[PDB]
Amino acid sequence: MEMEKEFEQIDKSGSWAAIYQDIRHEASDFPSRVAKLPKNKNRNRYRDVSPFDHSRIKLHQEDNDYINASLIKMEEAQRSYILTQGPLPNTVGHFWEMVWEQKSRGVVMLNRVMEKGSLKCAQYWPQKEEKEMIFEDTNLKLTLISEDIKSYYTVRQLELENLTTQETREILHFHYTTWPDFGVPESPASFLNFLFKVRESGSLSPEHGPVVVHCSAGIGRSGTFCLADTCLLLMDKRKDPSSVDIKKVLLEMRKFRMGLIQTADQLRFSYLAVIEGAKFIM
Numbered sequence: 001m002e003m004e005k006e007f008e009q010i011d012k013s014g015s016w017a018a019i020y021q022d023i024r025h026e027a028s029d030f031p032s033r034v035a036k037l038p039k040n041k042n043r044n045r046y047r048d049v050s051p052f053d054h055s056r057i058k059l060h061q062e063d064n065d066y067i068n069a070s071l072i073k074m075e076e077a078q079r080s081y082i083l084t085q086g087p088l089p090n091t092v093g094h095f096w097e098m099v100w101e102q103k104s105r106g107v108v109m110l111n112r113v114m115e116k117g118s119l120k121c122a123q124y125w126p127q128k129e130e131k132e133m134i135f136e137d138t139n140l141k142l143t144l145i146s147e148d149i150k151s152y153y154t155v156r157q158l159e160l161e162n163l164t165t166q167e168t169r170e171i172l173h174f175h176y177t178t179w180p181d182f183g184v185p186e187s188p189a190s191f192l193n194f195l196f197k198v199r200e201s202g203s204l205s206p207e208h209g210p211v212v213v214h215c216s217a218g219i220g221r222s223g224t225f226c227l228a229d230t231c232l233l234l235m236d237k238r239k240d241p242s243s244v245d246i247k248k249v250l251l252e253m254r255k256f257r258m259g260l261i262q263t264a265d266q267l268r269f270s271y272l273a274v275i276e277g278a279k280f281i282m
Protein backbone atom coordinates (compact mmCIF):
# COMPACT_ATOMS: atom_id res chain seq x y z
CA MET A 1 0.00 0.00 0.00
CA GLU A 2 0.91 3.73 0.41
CA MET A 3 1.98 4.72 4.01
CA GLU A 4 -0.59 7.44 5.09
CA LYS A 5 -3.61 5.26 4.10
CA GLU A 6 -2.04 2.03 5.46
CA PHE A 7 -1.77 4.26 8.65
CA GLU A 8 -5.49 5.24 8.93
CA GLN A 9 -6.46 1.61 7.99
CA ILE A 10 -4.36 0.20 10.96
CA ASP A 11 -5.71 2.96 13.32
CA LYS A 12 -9.40 2.34 12.29
CA SER A 13 -8.91 -1.49 12.55
CA GLY A 14 -6.87 -1.18 15.85
CA SER A 15 -4.23 -3.73 14.59
CA TRP A 16 -0.81 -2.11 15.64
CA ALA A 17 0.00 -5.09 17.99
CA ALA A 18 -0.69 -7.62 15.16
CA ILE A 19 1.49 -5.72 12.58
CA TYR A 20 4.34 -5.35 15.19
CA GLN A 21 4.16 -9.09 16.04
CA ASP A 22 4.45 -10.01 12.28
CA ILE A 23 7.75 -7.95 12.19
CA ARG A 24 9.06 -9.75 15.32
CA HIS A 25 8.25 -13.20 13.71
CA GLU A 26 9.95 -12.38 10.32
CA ALA A 27 13.09 -10.68 11.83
CA SER A 28 16.59 -12.18 11.23
CA ASP A 29 18.37 -14.29 13.89
CA PHE A 30 22.21 -14.56 13.72
CA PRO A 31 24.91 -15.69 16.23
CA SER A 32 25.99 -13.30 19.03
CA ARG A 33 28.73 -15.63 20.47
CA VAL A 34 31.31 -12.87 21.34
CA ALA A 35 28.65 -10.87 23.37
CA LYS A 36 27.90 -14.02 25.47
CA LEU A 37 31.54 -14.93 26.48
CA PRO A 38 31.83 -14.75 30.33
CA LYS A 39 34.72 -12.19 30.17
CA ASN A 40 32.17 -9.70 28.55
CA LYS A 41 29.34 -9.90 31.16
CA ASN A 42 30.20 -6.42 32.65
CA ARG A 43 30.28 -4.90 29.07
CA ASN A 44 26.52 -5.56 28.49
CA ARG A 45 23.75 -3.46 30.12
CA TYR A 46 20.94 -6.03 29.28
CA ARG A 47 21.39 -9.86 28.89
CA ASP A 48 18.71 -9.97 26.07
CA VAL A 49 20.30 -7.14 23.88
CA SER A 50 23.52 -8.18 22.06
CA PRO A 51 25.23 -7.24 18.79
CA PHE A 52 25.39 -9.95 16.04
CA ASP A 53 28.92 -11.29 15.40
CA HIS A 54 28.75 -10.41 11.65
CA SER A 55 28.01 -6.62 12.15
CA ARG A 56 29.64 -5.88 15.61
CA ILE A 57 32.09 -2.94 15.96
CA LYS A 58 35.58 -4.17 16.92
CA LEU A 59 37.84 -2.08 19.26
CA HIS A 60 41.43 -1.83 17.80
CA GLN A 61 42.97 -3.43 21.01
CA GLU A 62 44.25 -7.09 21.13
CA ASP A 63 43.40 -8.02 24.81
CA ASN A 64 39.57 -7.62 24.32
CA ASP A 65 38.00 -6.06 21.15
CA TYR A 66 34.37 -6.26 22.44
CA ILE A 67 31.79 -3.37 22.69
CA ASN A 68 27.97 -3.65 22.59
CA ALA A 69 27.64 -1.75 19.25
CA SER A 70 26.53 -2.63 15.64
CA LEU A 71 27.20 -1.15 12.14
CA ILE A 72 23.84 -0.62 10.30
CA LYS A 73 24.85 -0.22 6.56
CA MET A 74 21.91 0.97 4.29
CA GLU A 75 23.11 0.26 0.66
CA GLU A 76 20.31 1.97 -1.42
CA ALA A 77 20.07 5.05 0.89
CA GLN A 78 23.96 5.33 1.10
CA ARG A 79 23.84 5.94 4.89
CA SER A 80 25.66 4.10 7.75
CA TYR A 81 24.93 4.34 11.54
CA ILE A 82 26.59 2.80 14.63
CA LEU A 83 23.84 1.86 17.17
CA THR A 84 25.13 1.22 20.74
CA GLN A 85 23.85 0.95 24.36
CA GLY A 86 24.28 3.82 26.80
CA PRO A 87 27.81 3.48 28.23
CA LEU A 88 28.35 1.68 31.59
CA PRO A 89 30.80 2.77 34.31
CA ASN A 90 33.34 0.16 33.01
CA THR A 91 32.80 1.02 29.24
CA VAL A 92 33.02 4.88 29.03
CA GLY A 93 36.71 4.57 27.83
CA HIS A 94 35.71 1.91 25.19
CA PHE A 95 32.87 4.21 23.97
CA TRP A 96 35.28 7.14 23.22
CA GLU A 97 37.91 4.67 21.76
CA MET A 98 35.19 3.59 19.24
CA VAL A 99 34.27 7.24 18.35
CA TRP A 100 38.06 7.91 17.76
CA GLU A 101 38.77 4.67 15.75
CA GLN A 102 35.59 4.91 13.57
CA LYS A 103 36.20 8.69 12.71
CA SER A 104 32.70 9.73 13.79
CA ARG A 105 31.86 13.52 13.78
CA GLY A 106 28.62 13.24 15.85
CA VAL A 107 27.12 11.39 18.88
CA VAL A 108 23.28 11.31 19.10
CA MET A 109 21.87 10.72 22.67
CA LEU A 110 18.06 10.06 22.96
CA ASN A 111 17.76 9.44 26.76
CA ARG A 112 18.41 11.29 30.09
CA VAL A 113 21.11 9.95 32.48
CA MET A 114 18.30 9.36 35.04
CA GLU A 115 14.76 8.26 33.98
CA LYS A 116 12.01 6.61 36.09
CA GLY A 117 14.31 7.18 39.19
CA SER A 118 17.10 4.82 37.92
CA LEU A 119 20.37 5.36 36.02
CA LYS A 120 19.97 4.67 32.23
CA CYS A 121 23.64 5.52 31.33
CA ALA A 122 26.93 6.82 32.84
CA GLN A 123 27.70 10.61 32.96
CA TYR A 124 30.20 10.03 30.06
CA TRP A 125 30.92 13.71 29.03
CA PRO A 126 32.17 16.78 31.08
CA GLN A 127 29.61 19.30 32.45
CA LYS A 128 32.07 22.24 33.00
CA GLU A 129 34.75 23.68 30.64
CA GLU A 130 37.45 23.77 33.40
CA LYS A 131 36.84 20.10 34.55
CA GLU A 132 37.97 17.86 31.65
CA MET A 133 37.77 13.98 31.71
CA ILE A 134 40.74 11.58 31.25
CA PHE A 135 40.02 7.86 30.32
CA GLU A 136 43.31 6.23 31.53
CA ASP A 137 42.38 2.73 30.13
CA THR A 138 41.91 4.20 26.56
CA ASN A 139 44.49 7.10 26.84
CA LEU A 140 41.94 9.78 25.73
CA LYS A 141 41.11 13.29 27.04
CA LEU A 142 37.67 14.92 26.56
CA THR A 143 36.93 18.71 27.08
CA LEU A 144 33.63 20.62 26.98
CA ILE A 145 34.18 23.57 24.51
CA SER A 146 30.61 25.06 24.42
CA GLU A 147 26.96 24.14 25.14
CA ASP A 148 23.70 25.45 23.50
CA ILE A 149 20.54 24.53 25.61
CA LYS A 150 17.17 24.73 23.73
CA SER A 151 13.66 23.71 24.82
CA TYR A 152 13.69 20.10 23.39
CA TYR A 153 17.47 19.42 22.80
CA THR A 154 21.01 20.55 23.77
CA VAL A 155 24.04 20.68 21.35
CA ARG A 156 27.58 20.48 22.79
CA GLN A 157 30.96 21.01 21.13
CA LEU A 158 33.58 18.58 22.62
CA GLU A 159 37.36 18.20 21.96
CA LEU A 160 38.65 14.58 21.94
CA GLU A 161 42.45 14.19 22.23
CA ASN A 162 44.37 10.97 21.53
CA LEU A 163 47.03 11.32 24.31
CA THR A 164 49.33 8.77 22.47
CA THR A 165 49.69 10.94 19.27
CA GLN A 166 48.50 14.38 20.63
CA GLU A 167 45.98 14.49 17.68
CA THR A 168 42.70 16.41 18.46
CA ARG A 169 39.21 16.32 16.86
CA GLU A 170 35.97 18.24 17.31
CA ILE A 171 32.96 15.96 18.19
CA LEU A 172 29.34 17.32 18.17
CA HIS A 173 26.97 15.92 20.90
CA PHE A 174 23.24 16.05 19.91
CA HIS A 175 21.13 15.42 23.07
CA TYR A 176 17.34 15.00 22.69
CA THR A 177 16.24 15.76 26.31
CA THR A 178 12.35 15.62 26.16
CA TRP A 179 11.39 11.99 25.22
CA PRO A 180 8.78 11.09 27.94
CA ASP A 181 9.64 8.54 30.72
CA PHE A 182 6.56 6.44 29.51
CA GLY A 183 5.22 5.98 25.93
CA VAL A 184 6.17 8.13 22.84
CA PRO A 185 5.77 11.88 22.08
CA GLU A 186 2.20 12.97 21.07
CA SER A 187 3.54 14.97 18.02
CA PRO A 188 6.71 14.09 15.99
CA ALA A 189 7.42 17.81 15.35
CA SER A 190 10.31 18.28 17.87
CA PHE A 191 11.94 14.83 17.01
CA LEU A 192 11.90 15.80 13.24
CA ASN A 193 13.35 19.30 14.02
CA PHE A 194 16.14 17.50 15.99
CA LEU A 195 16.83 15.03 13.10
CA PHE A 196 17.12 18.07 10.72
CA LYS A 197 19.68 19.74 13.11
CA VAL A 198 21.84 16.55 13.14
CA ARG A 199 21.69 16.42 9.27
CA GLU A 200 22.60 20.16 8.92
CA SER A 201 25.78 19.59 11.05
CA GLY A 202 27.44 17.21 8.50
CA SER A 203 27.45 14.38 11.14
CA LEU A 204 25.42 12.00 8.82
CA SER A 205 27.46 12.73 5.68
CA PRO A 206 29.93 10.42 3.81
CA GLU A 207 32.97 12.68 4.47
CA HIS A 208 32.89 11.38 8.13
CA GLY A 209 32.76 7.94 9.80
CA PRO A 210 29.28 6.77 10.84
CA VAL A 211 27.26 8.76 13.46
CA VAL A 212 27.14 7.00 16.91
CA VAL A 213 23.46 6.69 18.09
CA HIS A 214 22.38 5.53 21.60
CA CYS A 215 19.54 5.42 24.14
CA SER A 216 19.58 3.00 27.12
CA ALA A 217 19.63 -0.38 25.19
CA GLY A 218 20.38 1.17 21.75
CA ILE A 219 17.37 -0.50 19.93
CA GLY A 220 14.14 1.44 20.70
CA ARG A 221 14.43 5.29 20.42
CA SER A 222 17.74 4.64 18.54
CA GLY A 223 15.82 2.43 16.03
CA THR A 224 13.21 5.17 15.50
CA PHE A 225 15.93 7.78 14.70
CA CYS A 226 17.72 5.68 11.93
CA LEU A 227 14.41 4.26 10.50
CA ALA A 228 12.91 7.80 10.06
CA ASP A 229 16.17 9.24 8.56
CA THR A 230 16.59 6.33 5.98
CA CYS A 231 12.86 6.33 4.93
CA LEU A 232 12.88 10.18 4.27
CA LEU A 233 16.17 9.89 2.23
CA LEU A 234 14.70 7.03 0.05
CA MET A 235 11.51 9.20 -0.55
CA ASP A 236 13.82 11.95 -1.97
CA LYS A 237 15.99 9.59 -4.13
CA ARG A 238 13.25 7.41 -5.84
CA LYS A 239 10.98 8.32 -8.85
CA ASP A 240 7.94 7.03 -6.87
CA PRO A 241 8.11 8.10 -3.16
CA SER A 242 4.89 6.06 -2.39
CA SER A 243 7.01 2.88 -3.11
CA VAL A 244 8.93 3.29 0.23
CA ASP A 245 7.76 0.43 2.53
CA ILE A 246 8.60 1.28 6.19
CA LYS A 247 8.09 -2.36 7.33
CA LYS A 248 10.58 -3.64 4.68
CA VAL A 249 13.20 -0.94 5.62
CA LEU A 250 12.88 -1.95 9.34
CA LEU A 251 13.38 -5.70 8.51
CA GLU A 252 16.50 -4.76 6.42
CA MET A 253 17.91 -2.78 9.46
CA ARG A 254 17.11 -5.80 11.76
CA LYS A 255 19.60 -7.89 9.68
CA PHE A 256 22.32 -5.71 11.43
CA ARG A 257 20.99 -5.28 15.05
CA MET A 258 18.27 -7.28 16.91
CA GLY A 259 15.15 -5.70 18.40
CA LEU A 260 15.02 -2.28 16.59
CA ILE A 261 11.62 -0.64 17.55
CA GLN A 262 10.70 -2.18 20.97
CA THR A 263 6.85 -1.54 21.05
CA ALA A 264 3.77 -1.17 18.76
CA ASP A 265 3.57 2.51 19.97
CA GLN A 266 7.21 3.13 18.74
CA LEU A 267 6.19 1.54 15.35
CA ARG A 268 3.15 3.91 15.06
CA PHE A 269 5.36 6.89 16.09
CA SER A 270 7.91 5.96 13.30
CA TYR A 271 5.07 5.96 10.65
CA LEU A 272 3.80 9.33 12.06
CA ALA A 273 7.29 10.91 11.86
CA VAL A 274 7.93 9.73 8.23
CA ILE A 275 4.40 10.90 7.08
CA GLU A 276 4.80 14.42 8.63
CA GLY A 277 8.50 14.71 7.58
CA ALA A 278 7.64 13.94 3.88
CA LYS A 279 5.28 17.04 3.74
CA PHE A 280 7.87 19.46 5.28
CA ILE A 281 10.59 18.34 2.75
CA MET A 282 8.63 19.76 -0.32
Ligand SMILES: CS(=O)(=O)NCc1ccc(Cl)cc1
Nearest residue numbers: 028029030031032033052053
Ligand atom coordinates in the same frame (compact mmCIF):
# COMPACT_ATOMS: atom_id res chain seq x y z
C1 LIG B 1 21.54 -17.05 18.26
S1 LIG B 1 21.90 -18.30 17.17
O1 LIG B 1 22.89 -17.89 16.23
O2 LIG B 1 22.27 -19.46 17.90
N1 LIG B 1 20.50 -18.59 16.32
C2 LIG B 1 20.22 -18.14 14.94
C3 LIG B 1 19.82 -19.19 13.92
C4 LIG B 1 18.94 -18.92 12.86
C5 LIG B 1 18.58 -19.91 11.93
C6 LIG B 1 19.11 -21.18 12.04
CL1 LIG B 1 18.70 -22.43 10.91
C7 LIG B 1 19.99 -21.47 13.08
C8 LIG B 1 20.31 -20.48 13.98
Ligand SMILES: CS(=O)(=O)NCc1ccc(Cl)cc1
Nearest residue numbers: 060061063064097137138139
Ligand atom coordinates in the same frame (compact mmCIF):
# COMPACT_ATOMS: atom_id res chain seq x y z
C1 LIG C 1 43.72 0.57 22.66
S1 LIG C 1 43.61 1.94 23.68
O1 LIG C 1 44.92 2.51 23.81
O2 LIG C 1 42.65 2.86 23.16
N1 LIG C 1 43.13 1.44 25.17
C2 LIG C 1 43.49 0.19 25.85
C3 LIG C 1 42.39 -0.80 25.98
C4 LIG C 1 41.27 -0.78 25.10
C5 LIG C 1 40.24 -1.69 25.18
C6 LIG C 1 40.26 -2.69 26.14
CL1 LIG C 1 38.97 -3.83 26.23
C7 LIG C 1 41.35 -2.77 27.04
C8 LIG C 1 42.37 -1.82 26.94
